[PDB]
Amino acid sequence: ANPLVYLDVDANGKPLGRVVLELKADVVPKTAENFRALCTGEKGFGYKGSTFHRVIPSFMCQAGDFTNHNGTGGKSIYGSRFPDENFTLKHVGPGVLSMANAGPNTNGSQFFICTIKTDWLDGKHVVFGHVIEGMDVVKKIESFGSKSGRTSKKIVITDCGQLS
Ligand SMILES: NCCOCCNC(=O)[C@@H]1CCNC(=O)/C=C/C(=O)N2CCC[C@](Cc3ccccc3)(C2)C(=O)N[C@@H](Cc2ccco2)C(=O)NCc2ccccc2CC(=O)N1
């Protein structure tokens, strides 16, 4: 069955609640496994303690740069980067979980959660899951963003892992 993972998120130390994500291992197993392992921290690194560094209302909330905290860094469990697995799943609406990148075949650890349908990213970013619980928490994160993406509070993934 598809893995379920969680992000517990805070803003300036105040808990916002839990986001639960279903990872579509049935369609993108390699991309799902990378995210799952970065949630559990089992390789010795991952999302715990890192930030949503770029949050743009009516677009998406971006996170996963646990090395540089600014959209330039991150690393996968497969080495630094890994290729785009497929573009089967589309950016259909709020709650889509997809890989951030810097062009083709540059996936590492950065990811985003959409707050709208972002169809112009179809075929360019690998979609690999969806929010199943806690979209209200995603909307709280979104509320601390701005047009440039700079956040007005430090938004931290306080804890994360797999629900089994
Ligand atoms: N109309 C309503 C809504 O409208 C909104 C319209 N805006 C949209 O569509 C916008 C329009 C186009 N601007 C952008 O590409 C924004 C770029 C941006 O912020 N950099 C800041 C961080 C560094 C940069 C450049 C750099 C430097 C060093 C190393 C690698 C790269 C640039 C980057 O590129 N780092 C990746 C992250 C990443 C690196 C490695 C793995 O991951 C990044 O952030 N990629 C951008 C991105 C991330 C997640 C989802 C989508 C998108 C596309 C997007 O943001 N597209």
Author numbering: 3 to 166
Relevant lines from the article:
A key structural feature shared among all cyclophilin isoforms is a shallow and highly conserved PPIase active site. Adjacent to the active site is the S2 pocket, a distinct exo-site that forms part of a long substrate-binding groove for peptides. In particular, three gatekeeper residues (positions 123, 124, and 145 in CypD) and one far S2 pocket residue (position 118 in CypD) are highly diverse among cyclophilins.
Adding a benzyl group to the tertiary carbon in the piperidine ring of JOMBt (resulting in A26) increases CypD potency 85-fold to IC50CypD = 0.20 μM.
